Amino acid sequence: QNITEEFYQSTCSAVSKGYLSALRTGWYTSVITIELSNIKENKCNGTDAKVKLIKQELDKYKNAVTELQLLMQSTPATGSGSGSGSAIASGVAVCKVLHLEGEVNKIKSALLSTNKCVVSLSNGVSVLCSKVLDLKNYIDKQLLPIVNKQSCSIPNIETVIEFQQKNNRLLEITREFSVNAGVTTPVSTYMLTNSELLSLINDMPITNDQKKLMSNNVQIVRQQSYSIMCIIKEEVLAYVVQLPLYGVIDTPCWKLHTSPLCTTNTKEGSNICLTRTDRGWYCDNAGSVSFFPQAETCKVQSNRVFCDTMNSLTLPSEVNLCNVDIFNPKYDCKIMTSKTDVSSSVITSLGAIVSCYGKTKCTASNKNRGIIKTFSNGCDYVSNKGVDTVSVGNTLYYVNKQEGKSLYVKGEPIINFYDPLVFPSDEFDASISQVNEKINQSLAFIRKS
Amino acid sequence: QNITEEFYQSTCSAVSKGYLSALRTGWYTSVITIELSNIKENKCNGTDAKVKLIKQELDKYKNAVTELQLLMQSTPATGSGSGSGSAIASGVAVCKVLHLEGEVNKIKSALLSTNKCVVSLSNGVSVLCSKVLDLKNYIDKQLLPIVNKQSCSIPNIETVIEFQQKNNRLLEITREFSVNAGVTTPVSTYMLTNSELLSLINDMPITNDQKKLMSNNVQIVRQQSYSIMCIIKEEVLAYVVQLPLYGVIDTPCWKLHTSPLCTTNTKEGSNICLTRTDRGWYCDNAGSVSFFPQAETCKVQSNRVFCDTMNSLTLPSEVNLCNVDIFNPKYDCKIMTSKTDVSSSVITSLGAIVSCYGKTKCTASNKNRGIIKTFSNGCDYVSNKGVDTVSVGNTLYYVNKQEGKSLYVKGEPIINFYDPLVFPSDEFDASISQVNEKINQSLAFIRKS
Amino acid sequence: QNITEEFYQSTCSAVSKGYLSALRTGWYTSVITIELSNIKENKCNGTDAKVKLIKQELDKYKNAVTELQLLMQSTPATGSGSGSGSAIASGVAVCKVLHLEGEVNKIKSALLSTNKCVVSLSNGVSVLCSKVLDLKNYIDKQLLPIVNKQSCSIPNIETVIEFQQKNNRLLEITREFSVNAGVTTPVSTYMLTNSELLSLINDMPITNDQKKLMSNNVQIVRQQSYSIMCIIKEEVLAYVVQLPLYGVIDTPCWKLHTSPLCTTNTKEGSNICLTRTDRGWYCDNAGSVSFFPQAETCKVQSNRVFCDTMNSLTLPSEVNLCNVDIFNPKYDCKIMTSKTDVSSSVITSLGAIVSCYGKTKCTASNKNRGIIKTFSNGCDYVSNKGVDTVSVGNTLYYVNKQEGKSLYVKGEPIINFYDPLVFPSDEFDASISQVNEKINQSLAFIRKS
Numbered sequence A, B, C: 001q002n003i004t005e006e007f008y009q010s011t012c013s014a015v016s017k018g019y020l021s022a023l024r025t026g027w028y029t030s031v032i033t034i035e036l037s038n039i040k041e042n043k044c045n046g047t048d049a050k051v052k053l054i055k056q057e058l059d060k061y062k063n064a065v066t067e068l069q070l071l072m073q074s075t076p077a078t079g080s081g082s083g084s085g086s087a088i089a090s091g092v093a094v095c096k097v098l099h100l101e102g103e104v105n106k107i108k109s110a111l112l113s114t115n116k117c118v119v120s121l122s123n124g125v126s127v128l129c130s131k132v133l134d135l136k137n138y139i140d141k142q143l144l145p146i147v148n149k150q151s152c153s154i155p156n157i158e159t160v161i162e163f164q165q166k167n168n169r170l171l172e173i174t175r176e177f178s179v180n181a182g183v184t185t186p187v188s189t190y191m192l193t194n195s196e197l198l199s200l201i202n203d204m205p206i207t208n209d210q211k212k213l214m215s216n217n218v219q220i221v222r223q224q225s226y227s228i229m230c231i232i233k234e235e236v237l238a239y240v241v242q243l244p245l246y247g248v249i250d251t252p253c254w255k256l257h258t259s260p261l262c263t264t265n266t267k268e269g270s271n272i273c274l275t276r277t278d279r280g281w282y283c284d285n286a287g288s289v290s291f292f293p294q295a296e297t298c299k300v301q302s303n304r305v306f307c308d309t310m311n312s313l314t315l316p317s318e319v320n321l322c323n324v325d326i327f328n329p330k331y332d333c334k335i336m337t338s339k340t341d342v343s344s345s346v347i348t349s350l351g352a353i354v355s356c357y358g359k360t361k362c363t364a365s366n367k368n369r370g371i372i373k374t375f376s377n378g379c380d381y382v383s384n385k386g387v388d389t390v391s392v393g394n395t396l397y398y399v400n401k402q403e404g405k406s407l408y409v410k411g412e413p414i415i416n417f418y419d420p421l422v423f424p425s426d427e428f429d430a431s432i433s434q435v436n437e438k439i440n441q442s443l444a445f446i447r448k449s
């Protein structure tokens, strides 16, 4: 809708509100097939140049099949990482079924007459099939009358050119699979062309507005998809495409921006610092909040946030209280402490946080007008209305030029409520109460003395 | 062999045993050559369409050579990172030799009659050579009678098509090298086709079962290899392929899984936490243990672990005592402390650790039966026998479906042996004794008072 | 010039001096155009094989245009990350202008007669234009007399082959843009060939020695560039290439190497450790020092360092005092403390730091001579003169073979100036004075008692 933003001067943080959710919760598994020819590399006596080229491209086909055969032996399972298990388990389950006797025949037969079908496998999963390239019919009808005789028939050059074209796709598929150990992501247009992907989106048992969502964001849908190599058996090459399912849609999302907040004394080493933790994306999800701590797991498209729940934490909705009253007791807001007063900026959705310390030169400029604000020591913020760049020391940053309203929530920097002599100044993952507890402990060790 | 797994309730950790080692310790360097033609871009008067296409593809060849010439000037050396020095130094050493006078002639001459050879260079390294594409013979015999006259001879269309085909590989090689600054990894099938790689594996002075190991895991062999650009000199393009050498084979490996272990009091902020560090892969290696702390440096293929020793630490074998008696004195087991009681799961090899805290909903489900276990606050574990998924808050995880035996080692959670008032609750990289030492120090500051 | 290196025994660190700077501060934006044909996929009755191939390649063209049309709707803006805002804002600004009425016509018209031009847009930016592929003229003059009639004219096979060739580039461009959501980096040779890039470098309003710098490091220039998709409107495909501008040139750069420094007592757990922080690249920049903490943001070419200022911190030049007198007061040198005495090495520019502890076996070897140094417990260093490898436990490292002079600055390891009983042994981001302050605090808690 209408993007908005709040900067909290008291904690050197900012929240961008107004975004709408799209969280991956499930997976559609589709089977993609290429019908192959069982040729025997039949050789006949021929030195005709058009015969050589047909043999040369038939060898590239033979090798492609044989490399895919040595690659399906080695169980494709290297799309797992970071303790979350395998993203691909849904599809690896389908590959296991395909290796069952008569299951390839079952797709062979549904794809006897048509390109699309809905096959139910003997494990109860109703997969969408698709034949995307027919090399069995091509090689068997155009190329065997050419090599299956005592002396070779001579082909026309259009056949030579059309075979190179048709075989190309099989080769690029093999190429990708052999440098990725059977699993790819993103899913390339060789794995699945824009037309085939859009048909597959159109053909799924899902709601029309969610078909619209995927069609309008196909690049993001690709980036969140996998292609898994299954099996080459009985004149069929089969691989599984795993497409994202968005079980959470149109819940509010917001992004937390954080920057270090220090004191501004003139003596170096007399200064204390604190910074809010768990910067990142927060989406309302099923009564709680899904939190996405890694910067890259969320792709943003206008006002929609596409995230994978696989690398997220689930928090109580009280976590939002850290943005309105960082001292409330409902939620133990987490902070980091240091004495590292080094200047820096964070480009937010509608502006920029600037943490300026020491002798660093900190400004915000307009392209035509030059400098229009100078930041003082401390943590400060500027809206993107009328600003194009911000500079901190020798680095220049470009402010985002999105339309929206910022709100500067004034407040005392909470670093000023702390006595520097009893401040726990090297805390890596503490909390507001956990710092007040060590202060109250260290106020007792000075109480007796 | 038979994968097994032990979960230690007392420390919220688990070990997967049964894997077999394959650690990269060395490098084979092979020289890959493409013989080139020194054509002068000879132009003759011709507007015949088949002449244009031959000129168009000869310009793409000329430029390819000239870009590779400007790229070999800039010393290919950007495959170094993280303080470990250069992975590629073995091959960069061979490139330096190749620039010596008469060393290209020496390979020119061994490859006068055959495609394979074993050349000894003037530095005593016995490299495997290989001519993979002959453009000198092709261009000099099919294309100069076509452009080296007053008026051009006209070529047949098969020549046009065959030249595009043969020249393609040179172009994709140039493409790769110019976006990677002379070093690539993985090694693409353009750098080295599956056939050429399998021949090169077959042709090395190594033991037959280790030839088998590499042939059966070519995708992993590629991912651990480099291609380095050397030199274009005297009608030869030469680049070096560095293949992995597995100096450690068939020693036991095991993977440590760790998850946070906290108290389960009902009051928020009254809870302490600890977590074991150095999760990852451990392989027995030459009387010690090679430890691989980064998740991605180890590719797993069935029960074999392929790791690069370049990013590993070497530990005493006593490090395994942390999995059997975390309090023993032989080895100072390392732990992290916090008050971050946030729920999470770790998908292990044969099961799942679940650290459930607060109000988080934590279950394990079977596809057909639905929920079949509910986790309580604390750290717990479930085997993959009869379970397909585990859910923690809004995230769903897929359990691995490998065959093996799990063993639930019951025990008191060691977090319960600690007095929360004297607990060092924000320790980033501590150790069991190092925490007991600060407890014993803080038991003295309360002893006088 | 002459690379040099200093190892500081007192702090287990080393500095490599002698490098020359090249820091990205700005951006050149160029507009790259491909003139397109507005064909209507005109179908006529034809089953001639050469007609099929022309239709097949015209469909691949139609789809390419239509996918690029659905991709330009979704605002290309996923080259932003890590709080630094968008690297691409300079170019996204040009895309916004191009969507203005009559701005595509303005480039259409400057490129009516020539391939190069300098167009001033209605926002005052003087961009370099370029027409790199003309498919409007090709399709309109060779292919419409072929499909714009009642029955199709038959084309020659050279036309079929030339169209495949010319259309290829458009297809690979679409391929790249659709798996990258409209932004690519590095800039591929499909986005911009070496010839086109070198012309664009030659054609910019910049100084001749800086043209030389870019021409001689084109691979690095690519790696630091972006390609952004703009707009398909009025028979023009336009995308923006953003090339690096080096606002800082030929200032001194140096790289800091750091390794843990511990005590060498024989009892495990009685040992304290400290390590200098902020290892990395330091370049003099405009009276301060630009510091590059991430290892990969700086590409090194002989003695030149190419860095992006976007991910850098700006420090006072007094930060160099940490390498000459780590205790000076001008700058609060930052250190990390632990009890993690685990052995390791750092390969420097002209040598190797070795931190050897426990029972670890630590040597430096020469290829022909074998072991030539054995390291003792502590932190030590060896020059690359006469050494080829260094081994720490089970890992082998290759020393860099660059020419230069090392200097071993002897000195007492400063870890020895600390009383282990009052040492803050788990400090994550402390400083020299900040450790002396907690020592002086903990010397008072023992003073009363």
Ligand SMILES: *[C@@H]1O[C@H](CO)[C@@H](O)[C@H](O)[C@H]1NC(C)=O
Pocket: A436, A437, A440
């Ligand atoms: C600190 O401790 C005193 C006495 O033990 C108590 O009365 C006071 O409320 C405590 N304050 C905080 C903020 O915990």
Ligand SMILES: *[C@@H]1O[C@H](CO)[C@@H](O)[C@H](O)[C@H]1NC(C)=O
Pocket: B436, B437, B440
């Ligand atoms: C703690 O200190 C006391 C006296 O200094 C000593 O007797 C005791 O063994 C120590 N305990 C530990 C666990 O270090």
Ligand SMILES: *[C@@H]1O[C@H](CO)[C@@H](O)[C@H](O)[C@H]1NC(C)=O
Pocket: C436, C437, C440
């Ligand atoms: C430590 O404190 C004493 C008295 O408070 C002071 O005289 C001394 O100079 C201090 N030393 C340091 C290194 O701060």
